Amino acid sequence: VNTNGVESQHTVAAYSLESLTEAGAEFQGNYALQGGNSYVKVENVWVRAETAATGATGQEIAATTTAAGTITADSWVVDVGNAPAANVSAGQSVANINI
Amino acid sequence: ETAATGATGQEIAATTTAAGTITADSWVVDVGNAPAANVSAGQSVANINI
């Protein structure tokens, strides 16, 4: 995702569609609302998203919604935060392997 | 073009600062101004330098 015009790679947790549809979520386009949490379909995997103006960094807009009964009308942005349950990174790169 | 002129949430192109005579704004790619005819090209035939 590009922030302020420069791209970067962020690791964020992913949620399966089956769990979302089992929990009783209301969907709209690429946007979902399971309840107190909101999700956007930026790619084939669903990710929790922040409402708007939280990062205040001009991040790429994940999706836009409308009334749709009980859906807030806002321009949603993928949550750059929301670290996974177990955030583990590779100790060394491929070119710096030391075992 | 400057920010708050597309009014669609378009992807931000670049952000600048003062740096002298440059206005600090979140510039965005100006959708529109399609290639128009009758515009000066690079060089003439007799002065081709590529």
- Which technique? cryo-EM
HEC states along chain A? Answer: CEECCEECCCCCCCECHHHHHHHCCEEECCEEECCCCEEECCCCCEEEEECCCCCCCCCCEEEECCCCCCCCCCEEEECCCCCCCCCCCCCCCHHHCCC
What residues form DSSP beta bridges with A64? A75
Chain B residues whose CB is inside 8 A of the A2 CB are 11-12
Amino acid at A46: W
User: Which of A60, A65, A78 best tests the B interface by mutation, with the highest count of B CBs <10 A?
Assistant: A60
**Side-chain half-sphere exposure of A37, counting CA atoms within 13 A:** 14
